[PDB]
Design a protein around this nucleic acid. Structure first.
Ligand code: ZN
Lengths: 158, 137, 108, 84, 73, 143, 103
RNA sequence: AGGUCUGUGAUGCCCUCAGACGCCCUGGGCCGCACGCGCGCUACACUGGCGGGGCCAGCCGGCGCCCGCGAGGACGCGCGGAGCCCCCGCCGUGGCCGGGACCGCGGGCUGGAACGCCCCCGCGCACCAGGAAUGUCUUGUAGGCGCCCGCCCCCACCGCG
């Protein structure tokens, strides 16, 4: 239902103010019509999605996909960070991929050191480059000649 | 709370408890109903009413101070009408059962009346969270 | 026979309102809620006058039958000429469209 | 015929005086009540292009009421522009 | 063309149906259906009884398919 | 259900209303073979009759069988809604009943006879073999 | 005095509708007039066959007319009806750039 | 000499002009069916059908209470989004719980007026992957899945998106 670019979602005004400030880092990730917003604060370590524990997100079979940014690296740094992700857009899979992208970008920023940041960048991008850089391709239009983007209505030459 | 436990276990356990405690009591017209024009046949299980009620109460708890109309819940139980040699079209569920369920809940003060519709009363939130922690272990 | 269990000999002079709750949706709607219209009432009054005292030709093709019209002789239009029709008890509660053919059957 | 009528028992069947629901479209003719008895007693909407008196293929969207064919000629002035 | 009983009349339900598998390690409702020459639901129910007995265990349960193993061998 | 070995009373081939039901299919759907009896009117009928609807047809017993017979001839006297009967109303009785295989032939037949004598439009299209409802026949269903 | 007045600008052309606001904000330099909310564009759409007789390959015109609009409800009662007229005069005269003031 | 004088206060020349081809009113017809084919829609099933549950879109978008199985109906106010899919069970290769054409009672809506459209019970046609022939397509593409607008008193298997 949510567009993804609403001012409310982008600024995460849903959270109460006194807890809004404690989140410092801001991150973003998207795939196709899906926008995921992540706020980070250092802590004992934990993740959330749309007010849900990270484990119990229901593509089920894609749990490893939502958690790849973690098991790729060590849990050492993920231990000291806590996230409150909020996602909205089109399709379960798109939301999944956007979420993992946001996780990667957010963890990358919080390192606070540029050299180790570059080292993590090299490690992560070696694996699936589309964990940091976004995916560009997007749905295209349809022309009146046919009933699809490229397909045309069947023609009878006789 | 509830949000850290999947809906599959929570719904069934709360349904069993809701039947044992005698909160909701299935009326007579639960014998011969199809639950929505979209469907074709009748429910196979013998206690669909209580599952439906538990899903509804969870829906109300998740919505917080927002208010949900009887029809608003009926669009979340919509299905697809088939068997008509024409493209399938979506349709809404039945509202009478939902209405009876909310009446039964409200008669127990678990569901406060708002400006439009209703929302979860504080004691209802208490009960939902209590069962959630009780079954979390 | 009968009519929804109602008698026939008494069906004469038997109030249309009483039978109305014994018919289908269309009659209980038009006759009750939406009501009737002037020309049809004039038609019925004319038929009453004749029965009290030649076939009544008419263009009316949606004039739901009454019960007292059993045994009457009325002609009807089919877009070209005038057809005769006689009303029978089981035919009560219906229109005059079904009893006047506008086309003709097909043959080879 | 002003001094005549039907039976009272039949009068109960008179159509509800509740005004008819089949009006006539007026883009902007004062609503006021021999051949006058039935010159145009039949009542029906007559929506038509406000340019050409043609009742066929008229857009009612946004309250235009313009024939599709006569739309192209004046679209340039009306503001509609052909891009994309 | 092929007709399968939906329930064993008698004996069949222990002399063999509960024994043919015993001389097997892996199985599935369809494997036995084609093997034992009977319907599917019978295999479902019988496998329920067997797992309750404890001899036969599960490896990958799902709504569509549930492979079993002969733990007691 | 919860049955592996057959009942000692297992009736392998049931019979009712001049129709025979094989005793190896689930109960609710096997009964559908009766003309005039579908699913909806099945699961409702049994339940009022205190019968399990997921047990094989071969397992029922006389007492259950006859009990079902009774509700199946005088159903309105058992709570079933009046809007559920196949014949929601009758022309001569004026009441609401449910008719079955033995007397379902004389329900479209005698109906037709009524159409003929009245010289209705609907009857004529039934005699020359034409569509009854508003249906295009220029190119539809060519024989 | 104070009226909680509103300013609304409606038009089709992006050029003038964007230049006119700049002059307005100039005029409200000292009366506190501030940023305008820019509503989503109301892209009206119409399609039509290009052939009056419907011959040949079926083709379609696609005309659309956008309706940009901006709102300067900032003034509210911050200004008096005395200079609300002054607000409406020092502004430039654009031929078509409809506007309306409500409280 | 492709189509359009039947889009127009765009028009030459012909035909009609007081028993009218003018304008208007009541009816009927444009849908009528032994048959030939053109664009489409639904299927012939286990990579599936039914029931319960969880859940996310965009062109954009209106809701509460109460009766009614449902379609719908009486009130009162400004408030708000889905199919595929995933999970648990039943069915078990049988033209069967695949398929929903056709037909019989009935309950409602629009309209002055149902021949129009919806919902319920019942009956349950062909169809076992389709010959000669032939059409379209290279990334968010084909294919599958659904959702809004157009003409519209009611109705979308159509068209634009
Ligand atoms: Zn025009």
């Amino acid at each position: 239902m949510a567009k993804g670019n609403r001012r409310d979602l982008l600024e995460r005004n849903d959270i109460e103010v006194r807890e809004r400030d404690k989140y410092t880092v801001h991150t973003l990730g998207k795939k196709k019509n899906s926008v995921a917003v992540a706020f980070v604060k250092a802590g004992k370590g934990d993740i959330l999605v749309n007010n849900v524990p990270l484990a119990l997100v229901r593509p089920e079979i894609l749990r490893t996909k939502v958690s790849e940014p973690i098991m790729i690296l060590g849990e050492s740094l993920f231990k000291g960070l806590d996230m409150n992700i909020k996602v909205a857009g089109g399709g379960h899979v798109s939301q999944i991929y956007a979420v993992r992208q946001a996780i990667s970008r957010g963890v990358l920023a919080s390192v606070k050191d540029e050299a180790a940041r570059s080292e993590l960048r090299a490690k992560l991008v070696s694996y699936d480059r589309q964990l940091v850089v976004s995916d560009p391709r997007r749905c295209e239009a349809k022309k009146f000649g046919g009933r699809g983007a490229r397909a045309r209505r069947q023609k009878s030459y006789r | 709370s509830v949000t850290r436990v999947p809906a599959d276990v929570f719904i069934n356990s709360f349904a069993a408890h809701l039947k044992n405690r005698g909160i909701i009591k299935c009326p007579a017209f639960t014998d011969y109903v199809k639950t929505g024009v979209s469907r074709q046949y009748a429910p196979r299980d013998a206690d669909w009413f209580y599952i439906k009620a538990a899903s509804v109460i969870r829906h109300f708890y998740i919505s917080g101070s927002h208010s949900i109309g009887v029809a608003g819940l009926a669009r979340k139980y919509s299905s697809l009408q088939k068997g008509k040699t024409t493209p399938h079209h979506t349709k809404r569920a039945s509202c009478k059962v939902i209405r009876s369920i909310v009446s039964q809940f409200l008669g127990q003060k678990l569901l406060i009346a708002g400006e439009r519709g209703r929302h979860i009363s504080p004691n209802g939130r208490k009960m939902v969270e209590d069962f959630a922690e009780g079954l979390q272990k | 026979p009968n009519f929804r269990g109602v008698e026939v000999e008494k069906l004469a002079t038997m109030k249309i309102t009483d039978i109305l709750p014994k018919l289908n949706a269309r009659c209980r709607r038009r006759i009750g809620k939406h009501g009737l219209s002037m020309k049809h009432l004039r038609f019925v009054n004319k038929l009453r006058l004749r029965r009290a005292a030649k076939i009544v030709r008419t263009h009316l093709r949606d004039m739901i039958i009454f019960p007292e019209m059993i045994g009457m002789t009325v002609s009807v239009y089919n877009g070209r000429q005038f057809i005769p029709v006689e009303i029978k008890p089981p035919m009560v509660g219906r229109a005059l469209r079904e009893y006047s053919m506008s086309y003709k059957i097909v043959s080879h | 015929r002003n001094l005549g009528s039907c039976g009272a028992e039949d009068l109960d069947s008179r159509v509800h005086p509740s005004t008819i629901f089949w009006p006539t479209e007026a883009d902007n003719a004062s609503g006021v009540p021999m051949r006058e008895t039935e010159f145009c007693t039949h009542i029906a909407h007559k929506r038509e292009c406000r340019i050409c008196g043609n009742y066929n293929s008229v857009y009612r969207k946004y309250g235009l009421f313009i024939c599709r064919r006569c739309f192209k000629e004046n679209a340039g002035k009306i503001g509609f522009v052909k891009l994309h | 063309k092929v007709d399968y009983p939906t329930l064993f009349a008698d004996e069949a339900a222990m002399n063999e149906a509960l024994k043919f598998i015993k001389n097997s390690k892996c199985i599935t409702h369809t494997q036995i259906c084609e093997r034992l020459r009977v319907s599917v639901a019978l295999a479902k129910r019988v496998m329920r009884q067997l797992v309750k007995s404890g001899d036969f265990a599960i490896v990958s349960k799902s709504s569509r398919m549930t492979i079993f193993k002969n733990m007691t061998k | 259900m919860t049955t592996i070995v057959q009942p000692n009373d297992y009736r392998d081939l049931l019979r009712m209303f001049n129709t025979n039901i094989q005793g190896k299919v689930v109960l609710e759907c096997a009964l559908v073979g009766i003309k005039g009896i579908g699913r909806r009117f099945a699961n409702v009928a049994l339940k009022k009759a205190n019968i399990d609807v997921h047990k094989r047809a071969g397992e029922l017993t006389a007492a259950e069988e006859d009990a079902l017979m009774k509700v199946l001839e005088d159903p309105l006297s058992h709570g079933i809604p009046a809007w559920m009967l196949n014949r929601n109303n009758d022309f001569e009785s004026g009441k609401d009943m449910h008719i079955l295989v033995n007397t379902i032939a004389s329900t479209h037949r005698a109906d037709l006879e009524r159409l003929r004598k009245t010289r209705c439009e609907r009857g004529v299209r039934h005699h020359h073999n034409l569509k009854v409802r508003g249906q295009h026949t220029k190119s539809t269903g060519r024989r | 005095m104070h009226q909680k007045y509103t300013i609304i600008v409606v038009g089709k052309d992006l050029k003038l509708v964007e230049r006119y606001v700049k002059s307005i904000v100039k005029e409200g330099r000292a009366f506190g007039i501030s940023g305008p909310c820019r509503a989503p564009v109301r892209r009206l759409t119409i399609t039509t066959r290009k052939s009056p007789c419907g011959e040949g390959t079926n083709t379609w015109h696609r005309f659309e007319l956008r309706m940009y609009k901006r709102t300067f409800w900032v003034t509210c009662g911050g200004n008096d009806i005395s200079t609300i007229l002054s607000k409406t005069v020092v502004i430039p005269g654009i031929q078509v750039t409809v506007e309306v003031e409500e409280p």
